[PDB]
Subunit: 135 residues, 3 copies
């Protein structure tokens, strides 16, 4: 939540890129950098009291205080039917990156059914790195 | 939650890239770097009291205080039917990266059904690194 | 949660890349680096009291205080039927990376059904590294 970057090629602080037919004679680079970072993050001071029934006195009657009732979840359930009477395929691939009828699924459940969580939770997900190179 | 970066090629602090027909004569690079990092993260001071029934006195009657009732989960259940009467395939692959009818599934459950979690949880997931290179 | 990076090629602090027909004569590089890192992470001071029934006195009656009722989970259960009356395949692969009808499944359960967890949990998952190289 401070530096969340998606960088396409490269990242630096001081960068030089001298390319593609240049002449670079008797330069003088003189850097005097002072780059300090001071982070103070998530400094928390919590004081909680969580009760469902506090201090019942004298012939009282309680019932069904908290009900998280009939629950139902169906997260990923998709149907891909296919009825083909006759099929023919011809594929001539060269230096390619194909994917035919693949199912890539990622599921992350951090804090599911629970009660009274304290502190810190986190979830990070970085996708695959794929690549094809021909000379 | 501070430096979460997805970098395509390279990462550095000081970087030089001299490429592709350059002439680079009698340079003078003089760096004086001071790069300190001070992190103070997640410093927590928690004080919690979690009761379902505190201090019942004198002929009282409690019932069904907390009910996380009938629960049902079906996370990943997908149907891929296929009815083919006649099929023919021809594939001529060269220097490729194919994937035909694959199922890649990742599931991560950190803190599922529970009560009264304290502290810190985390989940990190980095996908596969695939590659094809031909000269 | 501080440096979670997905780097495609390379990582460094000071980097030089001199490539592909360059001339690099009588340079003078003079670095004076001061790069200290001070981490103070997850420093926690917890003080918890977790009771279901505290201090019942005098002829009271409690019942069904906490009920995590009928529970049901079906995480990964997918159907891939196939009815083919006649099939023919022809595959001519050369310097490729194929995958036909594979099932890659990763499941990680850190803190499942439980009560009163204290401290720290973590889950990390790095996918496979695959590769094909032809000259």
């Amino acid at each position: 939540s401070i530096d969340v970057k998606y960088i396409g090629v490269k990242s630096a602080y001081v960068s030089y890129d001298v390319q593609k037919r240049t002449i670079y004679l008797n330069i003088t680079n003189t850097l005097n950098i002072t780059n300090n970072n001071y982070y103070s993050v998530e400094v928390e001071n919590i004081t909680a009291q969580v009760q469902f029934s506090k201090t019942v006195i004298g012939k009282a009657r309680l019932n069904n205080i908290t009900i998280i009732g009939p629950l139902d979840m169906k997260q990923i359930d998709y149907t891909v039917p296919t009825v083909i009477a006759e099929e023919m395929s011809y594929m001539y691939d060269f230096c390619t990156l194909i994917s035919i009828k693949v199912h890539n699924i990622v599921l992350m459940m951090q804090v599911t059914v629970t009660t009274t969580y304290f502190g810190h939770s986190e979830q990070i997900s970085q996708e695959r790195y794929q690549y094809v190179d021909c000379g």
